[PDB]
């Protein structure tokens, strides 16, 4: 798989603050806003919320989890979220076996704490319910390759 550096960008975004105060760890957004910044992409800003309106609106947009993880796989920047009627949730998904032959890997940040928490062992059926799980949107930025040649 091609996501070595997604994976890294994950790595090093945990540890920051996109805002200031405010660990990416305890911020999904700003999680995956330094993710983002590191692999050059643009990302639409904002909290979680407004990243999916902006992903709608300017994202290529994924048919399922399945996808979300081949497309992770071959290196390609891939973003999962569903909007709330107070707060959405964002996460990076990243290569590896779907969980329940259905939810692909991920990272994220939450101001949930460790239950909205993932350094990649958790898939985004694990940080989501039992009914988001099934509704959760992916987006895919297709227009450049977040990996180097092999
Ligand atoms: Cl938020
Ligand atoms: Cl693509």
């Known amino acids: 798989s091609l996501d070595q550096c997604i994976v890294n960008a994950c790595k090093n975004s945990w540890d920051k603050s996109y805002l200031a105060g405010t ?3 305890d911020n999904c957004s700003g999680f995956v806003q330094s993710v983002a910044a590191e692999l050059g992409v643009p990302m639409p800003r904002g909290n979680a919320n407004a990243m999916v309106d902006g992903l709608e609106q300017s994202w290529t947009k994924l048919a399922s989890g399945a ?3 081949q497309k992770a796989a071959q290196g390609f920047l891939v973003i999962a ?3 709330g009627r107070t707060y959405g949730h964002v996460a ?3 290569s590896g076996p779907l969980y329940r032959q ?3 890997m991920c990272w994220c940040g939450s101001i949930a ?3 909205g928490q993932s350094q990649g062992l958790k ?3 694990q940080v989501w319910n039992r009914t ?3 509704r959760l949107n992916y987006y895919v930025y297709s227009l450049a390759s977040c990996s180097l040649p092999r």
Request: hydrophobic share 40%.
């Open 23 to 25: 660990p990416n760890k």
């Open 67 to 69: 996808e979300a993880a």
């Open 81 to 83: 979220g569903l909007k």
């Open 92 to 94: 990076v998904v990243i």
């Open 102 to 104: 259905k939810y692909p």
């Open 113 to 115: 704490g460790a239950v």
């Open 123 to 125: 898939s985004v059926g």
């Open 132 to 134: 988001d799980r099934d």
